[PDB]
Amino acid sequence: MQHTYPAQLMRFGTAARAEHMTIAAAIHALDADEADAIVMDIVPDGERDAWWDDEGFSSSVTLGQLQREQGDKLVSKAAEYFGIACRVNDGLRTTRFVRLFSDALDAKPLTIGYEVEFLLATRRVYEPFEAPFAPHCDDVSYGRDTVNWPLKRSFPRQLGGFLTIQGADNDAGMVMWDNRPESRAALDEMHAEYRETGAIAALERAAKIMLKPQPGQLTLFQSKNLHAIERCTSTRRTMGLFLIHTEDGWRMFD
Amino acid sequence: MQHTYPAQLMRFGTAARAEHMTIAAAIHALDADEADAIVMDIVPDGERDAWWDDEGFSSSVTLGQLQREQGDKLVSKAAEYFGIACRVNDGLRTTRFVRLFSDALDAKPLTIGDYEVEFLLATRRVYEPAPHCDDVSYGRDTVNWPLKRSFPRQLGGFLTIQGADNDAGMVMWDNRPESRAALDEMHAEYRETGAIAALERAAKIMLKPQPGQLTLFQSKNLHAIERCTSTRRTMGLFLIHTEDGWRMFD
Ligand SMILES: [Zn+2]
Ligand SMILES: [Zn+2]
């Protein structure tokens, strides 16, 4: 039997439901399309540093970075990505952060193929950047090189999960819109519309959820929805990964 | 003081030479284009199984296999190849077989990459009862193959552990196909006509590696393994002499 934690469950256009839930229950609600985001109070004050300094992080290419590459550069970056994951996952799988999900869901690292593992998770440092802050979505199928990207299947309930460790001075958080771009090319066009026009005209019609996750909070959300992290005024630290629910069970990757 | 061994040194059209050399000296003779192959007596008759059974092999995608993949399957098969190399190379580094080269040449695994990751070091091969050549740059999917430099003195190196009863060996021709497309074209001629016309009057070397012998050769030359009547077991890798030093991969 599992720990329950204070949770706020958010759906577009609706007041947040406040409940005490297990991690597996929050993840089930998302996978059932019963929530767009859930924010949970996981780590109490004073214990936040221990999750970051966890010895399993000790010893970085992300899948989102791998997806940007094309042709021979995608072959060479895939070699870096998969070669690295194997060096670092032995440590990551022991982290309290990764164990949150392996325990709750019986999750395992996503594998390709012999089977070799995707990278499990990343610690993320956000340094002050004076920009709009950047809207993107995460979908394991969204390689820029459509032909040569080898994960061609989309999971409509793919989740992002990140635990906030240090918050920015200005309390920088996340905006999530009711908009799901259909492909990497669609996001890539949206980026060009932003840089030229300062805006994304399609968004002025979309409902948005603004989230300000605090130190110790885990934010779980449907990562296919467009979203963006606000400009930070000082250092923000988070740890995160993504989840997909496969025929063989829950799988984790970053 | 490094080990010294009996070596036979072959060169197209010239008499086989009998020398006695270190592994480093044999490799440097090939790398100076002063031999096409060298066969050396390395492992004494009582000791061959122990090389096969080295604990460093306790743990199957090769570079040659990866080369034949195209498009998304190339990216997927590359993920498998580099992922496996990460798993197994720490063991492989400790094997007597890999150490022949890392000791002789200060060789290291070939790397690719912002972060450097290793190619697979070596493989043990079991043969149970079409000529080709090996060049690191000869991926079939040329636009997507990331290794663009050809090394003219690329070597293959294999130690024979168990020989076939019919004493099946290796033939090399003085013929160096210029890309994977050239090789695939010759394959289409062998299949469609029953030989490769260009090879008829080409100089050839016939090798008959025995158990305990190391065969080092210039792998860009077309070559073929003769058909075996019984089980043949070998351990093998390739060498290229890069800007950074000698690098091993399979
Ligand atoms: Zn995201
Ligand atoms: Zn060969």
Numbering used by the authors:
A (entry chain A): 1 to 59, 75 to 128, 131 to 150, 153 to 273
B (entry chain B): 1 to 59, 75 to 128, 130 to 145, 153 to 273
From the paper:
SadA is a member of the dioxygenase family from Burkholderia ambifaria AMMD. This enzyme is useful as a novel biocatalyst for the (R)-selective hydroxylation at the C-3 position of N-substituted branched-chain L-amino acids, especially N-succinyl-L-leucine (NSLeu), to produce N-succinyl-(2S,3R)-3-hydroxyleucine (NSHLeu) with >99% stereoselectivity. One of the oxygen atoms is incorporated into the substrate to form hydroxy amino acid, while the other oxygen atom is used to oxidatively break down α-KG into succinate and CO2. This family of enzymes possesses a common protein fold, which is called the double-stranded β-helix (DSBH) fold, as the core of the structure, and an HXD/EXnH motif in the active site to coordinate the Fe(II) cofactor. The hydroxylation of amino acids is catalyzed by the ferrous [Fe(II)]- and α-ketoglutarate (α-KG)-dependent dioxygenases.
The crystal structures of SadA.Zn(II) and SadA.Zn(II).α-KG were determined at 1.77 Å and 1.98 Å resolutions, respectively. The structure of SadA.Zn(II) contained 11 β-strands, 6 α-helices and one 310 helix, and possessed the DSBH fold at its core, which was adopted in most of the α-KG-dependent dioxygenases. The DSBH fold of SadA was comprised of seven β-strands, four of which (β3, β5, β8 and β10) formed a major β-sheet and the other three of which (β6, β7 and β9) constituted a minor β-sheet. The β1, β2, β4 and β11 strands extended the major β-sheet. Six α-helices (α1-α6) were packed along the major β-sheet of the DSBH fold. The electron density maps of residues Ser60–Thr74 and Ala148–Phe152 were not observed in either of the structures. The data from inductively coupled plasma atomic emission spectroscopy (ICP-AES) showed that the concentration of Zn(II) was about 14-fold higher than that of Fe(II) in the SadA solution; therefore, the metal was modeled as Zn(II) substituting for Fe(II). Zn(II) is coordinated by the side chains of His155, Asp157 and His246, which are conserved in the dioxygenase superfamily. The dimers of SadA.Zn(II) and SadA.Zn(II).α-KG are structurally identical within 0.17 Å r.m.s.d. for 444 Cα atoms.
